[model samples]
Target: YDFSCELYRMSTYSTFPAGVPVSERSLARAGFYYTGVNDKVKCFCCGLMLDNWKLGDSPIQKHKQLYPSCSFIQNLVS
Candidate 1:
């Protein structure tokens, strides 16, 4: 599937919740971008989706936990 198309499609369907601002820098650093889903984001390189984020939650840590097998995670660790 076309990743950018998928990203755009997902974005159209989701919206960031009010009063919860996720950092764009942190997301980019973790190889992720917002899906615009409520507290949900997806890995740009691996298409891993994660949700239920809270304040102080690290995107990298969450990505590693949910997508340990993702190439981006492997590359990051190594």
Candidate 2:
């Protein structure tokens, strides 16, 4: 899973939509990789899935809320 790596994931975002309310860099840093399925994405550490982004969405907050037990979110908060 090359996309599990942040750098590789960052590279994949080159194809993501340019005007997302959430920046690609932030999503990559937060351990998410673009899924090439519309605006869907998943977290590497927890296999958490999210999609259908809308205005006022926050990737980091969404991840935390969706998967409160995820190790990745724990480290991010720590």
Candidate 3:
């Protein structure tokens, strides 16, 4: 299954992706990162699966929201 279109955040395991959905293995390597202000979470456009064992830049704060209602990111938070 593919989940490159889902909206999820590494800070919150509460959310899920589109296809396979979010898993601990996905954001395991995200480290102890916090969700920025007004950060509503989102999916990665590049369709790169999150690997916990691999030390790489987490897509936690990247990409825009999936839904249009999530335009909050356009205004830029304080």
**Top candidate by TM-score:** 2
**1-78 in candidate 1: lDDT tens per residue?**
344643553454345565554565566567776776576777877899877767888878888888898887777767
Model 2 Cα displacement at 70 (Å)? 1.0
- Candidate 1 lDDT: 0.68
Steric clash pairs (candidate 1) = none
Q: Which scores greater on lDDT, model 1 or model 2?
A: 2
Q: Give a tens-digit lDDT track for model 3, residues 1-78.
A: 122222233435444333333333434322212233222232332333322222343333332332322233232221
- How many clashes would you count in candidate 3? 0
How large an RMSD does model 1 have? 4.8
lDDT of each: 0.68, 0.82, 0.31
Between candidates 2 and 3, the one scoring higher on lDDT is: 2
Residue 73 in model 3: shift from native, Å?
Answer: 14
Question: Best-fitting candidate, measured by lDDT?
Answer: 2
Model 1, position 8, has a per-residue lDDT of: 55
lDDT of 2 by residue, 1-78 (tens): 434488987887888986677778788887899988778888988989887788777888998888989887888877
